[PDB]
Swiss-Prot record:
SMART domains: Tryp_SPc (SM00020). It holds the Pfam family Trypsin. InterPro entries: Peptidase_S1_Elastase_sf (IPR050850), Peptidase_S1_PA (IPR009003), Peptidase_S1_PA_chymotrypsin (IPR043504), Peptidase_S1A (IPR001314), Trypsin_dom (IPR001254), TRYPSIN_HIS (IPR018114), TRYPSIN_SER (IPR033116). Coiled coil: none annotated. GO terms for biological process: proteolysis. The gene is CELA1. This is Chymotrypsin-like elastase family member 1. Residues 1-238 form the Peptidase S1 domain. Ca(2+) binds at residues 59, 61, 64, 69. The keyword Signal applies. It comes from Sus scrofa. It comes from the Eukaryota. GO terms for cellular component: extracellular space. Keywords: Calcium, Disulfide bond, Hydrolase, Metal-binding, Protease, Secreted, Serine protease, Signal, Zymogen.
Amino acid sequence: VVGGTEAQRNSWPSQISLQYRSGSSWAHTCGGTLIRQNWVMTAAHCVDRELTFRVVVGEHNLNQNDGTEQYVGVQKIVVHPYWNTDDVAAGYDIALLRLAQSVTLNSYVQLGVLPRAGTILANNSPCYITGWGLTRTNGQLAQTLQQAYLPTVDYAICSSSSYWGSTVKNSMVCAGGDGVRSGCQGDSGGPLHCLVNGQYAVHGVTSFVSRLGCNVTRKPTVFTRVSAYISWINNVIASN
């Protein structure tokens, strides 16, 4: 997250760190949202690699002992069947991870609330992106969980020529684009929390940013629209 601030450690309890085994240790690679005690929602591209992934809930500082972490392996990965790694612009950048065990819920570990199917936010709706992604384009991952205020940019505006053009689909949510704040590498798969009717809900799964940079003006961060996959999510969880 570029232009973010450090999140309080109990503000976004559904946020998780998706990590892969890199030798005698683990490296953070993407974010995710805990949606069931044993299911995590993330981006399909985060798991394109044939790596050994694990999920950390109750995580706040990737480099220090927060004393609230729970480490659990990924037992099964279910990527959306229409996902195509060489075509992120087509959408379908979402996947569900079944954890090897159910995590214990507390003030640092809670299920993320998803929006009602079909919900579309009005332009400029209040949201916060969270994650440990790069704090600057071509920078380094954050140590502490970061959050940045990224208001939505509706489809009509986001798909206009000065923005993303036809790259963005109605199955996506765009947020930010002020050239100062944005998601960045390492934030993918994480949540886009939007305040609706007094409650925050995870409306997006971080998918991509411009190839020219993270915080590029008129190139808002793009997320997979969660409300367009409610049935898919339910069907997968009901199956596995």
